[PDB]
Structure 1
Amino acid sequence: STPGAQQVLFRTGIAAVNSTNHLRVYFQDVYGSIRESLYEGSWANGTEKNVIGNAKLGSPVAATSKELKHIRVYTLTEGNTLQEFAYDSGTGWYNGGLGGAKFQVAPYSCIAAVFLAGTDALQLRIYAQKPDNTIQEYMWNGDGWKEGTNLGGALPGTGIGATSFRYTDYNGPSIRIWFQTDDLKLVQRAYDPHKGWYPDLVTIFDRAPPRTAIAATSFGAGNSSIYMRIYFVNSDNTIWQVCWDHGKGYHDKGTITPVIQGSEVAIISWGSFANNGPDLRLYFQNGTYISAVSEWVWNRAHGSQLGRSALPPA
């Protein structure tokens, strides 16, 4: 290993945000602190000086952004309440207002978070699992945190993936979320502006490991068209990808890359098929220096490739 890699919690929560190829990756260190590594032409940071806050050991870690002007990172306190580490350009890092509400969730809850796409002002939807094992939406619409729509029951401790995009022929944002139900299937729920939440679950995978990591992204929004990619850790100790492509639907799935048993997963994307993209980046643990976080890359030039073998601080 390396001294730096040793500071990374084994099976750490992982989150990532980006403005095109300007990247931030969040993880938890062995002391419970949440740290930020970054890519700005090269990889840096992830050290004890790059701590944005503290969370319970083993906490989920979720993050979302508006470019890199506004970043929000969500974790659980020791008290199993949702908290928010917030960054705005010109202000820096601070404790976000979500913590004031002190929302208790299940101790084993995961978290997903999105800024809603294409809206006039900043709007956030956070998803977590309550002690009754239902998936609850929490909203920020500019005037305090409030519970939004309850999305019903899921496997206790389920992974939660989420994405928001705006169809260019609609006047409001769409949301897709993915999680695991008691039957061990992975499923999607969906919000569109003209329908609200659709009543049905859409199966994306028949049987997944219990509490497997789930991470999602979307890109290339157009007129009634979108592209999406969902990632999870399968029973073969590899990340699998499920593809939604416009005109083909959920048409393919397969292995991507090996991971450690019980690795967490994060995904970011940028660009689109129309402009020599997309670019995809996955972050996970595959045993590099034992506990380092590694990267997988997809791009138009070279397709599927391992990227940075060990993120900072490794």
Structure 2
Amino acid sequence: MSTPGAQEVLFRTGIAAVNSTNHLRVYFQDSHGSIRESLYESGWANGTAKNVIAKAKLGTPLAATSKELKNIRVYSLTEDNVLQEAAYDSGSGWYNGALAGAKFTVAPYSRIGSVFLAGTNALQLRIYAQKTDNTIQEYMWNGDGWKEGTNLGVALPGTGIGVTCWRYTDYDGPSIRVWFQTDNLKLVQRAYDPHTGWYKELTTIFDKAPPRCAIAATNFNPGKSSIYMRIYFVNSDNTIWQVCWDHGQGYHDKRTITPVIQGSEIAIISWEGPELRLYFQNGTYVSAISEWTWGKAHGSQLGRRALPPAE
């Protein structure tokens, strides 16, 4: 039970997504290795072979980040496991970013996380990937070329990488949180705040997760020394689980959210409300990408059953 379009979507494809409020873009890999863009603009569209923005190694990790939908960056691996960047800016179309020119080689099993730094009109990027020594390496662009940032230490080979960024309204710089899996299979957090920089502490957010389980995170409603974060990962019950940080309660909830196929990748986006949108494969038309939604109006509800090009 599939469709011609759904068959084009790679099984266990990497998934990434960006948005400006409820204006959405979702990136995935097709069965021939091309990275495609589906979009939501008061309705779903595209995701076809005419909507290719990049070509990457089969089974590549995918990450994306944006400033609204004015600047979009999509990260993947070349067949030589070099980090590369597909870039879009308003009124310039899609092009190759400078990242690949830096020739950052990572482990073949590396994932990728990516954020624009929040709370500034400047375009500042932090990318996170896994080197062949299994450490999680930050790579950065601040208008003075691509270079290595901070190394966050050793993770499980092939760990998922979740990352989110915001700016506290009472701080003068960005806060970054990065989640990954350690050798003991725990899910942990590294943290960056202004002034303190990277905290030394690793915080456990889940005791045991499947090896190389997908990890994805978002945040909403930043305020005065306050944030709200959601981290998603694929658990051993073949569902996405959610971990909640809420100002006033800290890390205080772990729940299953929705079923997925074995080994599904995941992507999360959000906007103020909060509105949450989760993307994953749950077996709809075998290989189509499905959507899960959260909003105040209706709470947890499945969304678009089969993203373009499935139907």
TM-score clears 0.5: yes
Cα deviation, 1:158-198, whole Å, max 9, x if unaligned, reads: 00000000000000000000000000000000000021000
Give 1:120 shift: 4.0
Aligned pair 1:154/2:150, yes or no?
Answer: no
Q: Is the aligned partner of 1:65 residue 2:66?
A: yes
Q: Which amino acid aligns with 2:198?
A: W
In 2: Cα distance, 1:65 partner to 1:206 partner: 32
For residues 2 and 121 of structure 1, the distance between their equivalents in structure 2, rounded to whole angstroms, comes to 43
Separation (CA, whole Å) in 2 of partners of 1:52 and 1:141: 24
Report deviation, 1:90: 1.1
Name the aligned partner's letter for residue 274 of structure 2.
Answer: P
Amino acid at match of 1:287: G
AA in 2 matched with 1:297: T
**Equivalences for 1:176-195 in 2 at 5 Å?**
176-195=177-196
SS in 1 for 2:304: coil
| 2:230 paired residue number | 229
Matched, 1:213 2:209: no
1:301 equivalent in alignment to 2:297: yes
Which residue identity is paired with 1:267?
I
5+ residue gaps, structure 2? none
Q: Which residue of 1 aligns with 2:269?
A: 268
| Amino acid corresponding to residue 10 of structure 2 in structure 1 | L
Q: Distance in 1 between matches of 2:145 and 2:192?
A: 22
Q: 2: distance between equivalents of 1:239 and 1:250? A: 17
Q: Report how many residues are paired.
A: 309
1:112 partner amino acid: G
In structure 1, distance between residues paired with 2:52 and 2:246: 38
Secondary structure of 1:100's counterpart equals helix
CA deviations on 1:111-152 (whole Å, 9 max, x unpaired) are 000000012411000000000000000000011000000000
| Structural RMSD (CA) | 0.4
Shift of 1:102: 1.3
Match of 2:125 in 1: 124
Q: How does 1:12-31 map to 2 (within 5 A)?
A: 12-31=13-32
**Take 2:60 and 2:14, find their aligned partners in 1: how far apart are those partners?**
6
Structure 1 residue 57: Cα displacement = 0.1
1:292 paired with 2:292, answer no
Q: CA deviation at 1:72?
A: 0.2
Q: Deviations over 1:226-274 (max 9, x none)?
A: 0000000000000000000000000001100000000000000000xxx
* Map of 1:7 onto structure 2: 8
2:251 corresponding residue in structure 1: 250
Equivalent position of 1:280 in the other structure: 276
Which letter does structure 1 place at the counterpart of 2:275? D
| 1:312 aligns to 2:308 (yes or no) | yes
User: Separation in 2 of the partners of 1:56 and 1:270?
Assistant: 31
Hey, what does 1:107 align to over in structure 2?
A: 108
1:165 aligns with 166
In terms of mean alpha carbon deviation, does 156-165 or 116-125 score higher? 116-125
Report the Cα distance in structure 2 between the residues aligned to 1:265 and 1:178, rounded to whole angstroms: 14
CA distance in 1, matches of 2:209, 2:16: 21
CA distance in 1, matches of 2:54, 2:136: 25
Give, as a single letter, the amino acid of the residue that structure 1 aligns with 2:227.
I
Identity of aligned residues (%): 83
Unpaired runs of at least 5, structure 1: 272-276
